[PDB]
Amino acid sequence: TKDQNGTWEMESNENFEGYMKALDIDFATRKIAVRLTQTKIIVQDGDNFKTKTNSTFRNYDLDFTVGVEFDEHTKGLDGRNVKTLVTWEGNTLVCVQKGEKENRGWKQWVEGDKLYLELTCGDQVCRQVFKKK
Amino acid sequence: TKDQNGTWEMESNENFEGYMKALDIDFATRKIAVRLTQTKIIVQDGDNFKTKTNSTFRNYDLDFTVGVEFDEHTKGLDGRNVKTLVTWEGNTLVCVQKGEKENRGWKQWVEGDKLYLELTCGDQVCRQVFKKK
C-alpha cells in the first residue's frame, strides 16, 4: 500500500496502439488517440481514489475504493461492460476488469518521483511513465 | 461494505464434515470438530478486521485488511500456504484462498442479527449461521 497522490506528467508511452487495437478501437480513432503529453492527477485518501486522466483528445475520470467490486461501462474507449476490482499486491495497485476480453486490467506503482502504469488486454501490454509535477 | 462487529454464537453448521474432508483433515480430528459449538468474535474498524473463531478444542485467529493480498498459513486446519484476498461484493465479504485446493474460499454476510458464512473447497460447501450476542 503506498502514496500515489499528485499531478503526474507523461514522459514515455509505449505500445498504446497495440493496446487499443486489442480493444478493437477503430483505426481512425487510434491515429488521433495516441497523445504523448498527458496529465494524471490522483487524490487518494485511504482506500478512496479520485483520478483524472487528461489529454487534448479525451479525458477519462475514475473513482473507486480499493477492495470494493464495481461495474464499469468503458464509455469513450471500447464501450464494453466489465466488473472491476482494484486491490494492493504489496505496493502495486492491481486492477482486473472481468468480461469478454482475457487478461484485461492494469497495474500502477510509484518508484521515487515517477509513476509507472502497465495496461494489458490479451497479449498486448502498453507501458507508460509519468513524472510528478 | 457493511458492519459485522460483535460476538456471534453458532446456531447451525451444515456439511462441516465434507468441507474438512475436501481439505484432507484426518478422520479423528473431523469427528471431534464436527460436534463442537463455535463462537466468532469480529472487531472491524473500517477495512481492518480482527477475528477469533473459538471452540473448546482449537481456535483460529485471523486479521486482514479488505483489498490487501496476504499470505495465510492455515495452521491448525490443513497447514497449507495460500494467498488470500478479501473484498466486498455488495454487502457480502468474499474471500479467495489461492493455492493447491480449487475453489477454496468463503463468503460472509449479516442479515439483521444473524451472520451467514459459506465455506467452499472443491465441490464441498459448508453453511454456518451465527446469532449476535
Side-chain angles (χ1 to χ4, degrees), chain A residues 1-2 14 19 25-26 40 56 77 80 82 90 102-103 110 112 117 119 130 132:
Chain A
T1 311
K2 224 231 144 304
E14 175 180 346
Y19 175 70
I25 295 181
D26 68 286
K40 216 169 196 70
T56 287
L77 201 56
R80 283 190 177 97
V82 295
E102 297 184 292
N103 190 39
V110 173
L117 172 60
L119 301 162
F130 299 69
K132 199 174 193 301

Side-chain angles (χ1 to χ4, degrees), chain A residues 118-131:
Chain A
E118 283 195 33
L119 301 162
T120 56
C121 189
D123 64 342
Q124 296 304 299
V125 182
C126 164
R127 298 174 186 89
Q128 307 183 343
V129 184
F130 299 69
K131 192 187 175 304

Side-chain angles (χ1 to χ4, degrees), chain A residues 11 15 34-35 37-38 42 48 50 59-60 67 69 74 77 84 87 91 97 99-100 104 110 112 129:
Chain A
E11 56 169 59
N15 193 36
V34 194
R35 289 291 169 283
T37 283
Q38 296 199 24
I42 296 175
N48 297 97
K50 293 113 290 164
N59 293 175
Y60 201 72
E69 183 195 80
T74 55
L77 201 56
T84 306
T87 50
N91 287 324
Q97 289 170 126
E100 152 61 41
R104 186 184 177 149
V110 173
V129 184

Side-chain angles (χ1 to χ4, degrees), chain A residues 17-54:
Chain A
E17 196 280 328
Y19 175 70
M20 297 192 282
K21 190 175 184 180
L23 288 182
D24 316 304
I25 295 181
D26 68 286
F27 183 78
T29 306
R30 296 205 305 268
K31 293 307 129 310
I32 51 174
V34 194
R35 289 291 169 283
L36 279 299
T37 283
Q38 296 199 24
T39 307
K40 216 169 196 70
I41 130 80
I42 296 175
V43 194
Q44 168 186 354
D45 185 34
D47 51 15
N48 297 97
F49 282 74
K50 293 113 290 164
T51 68
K52 301 219 285 193
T53 298
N54 306 337

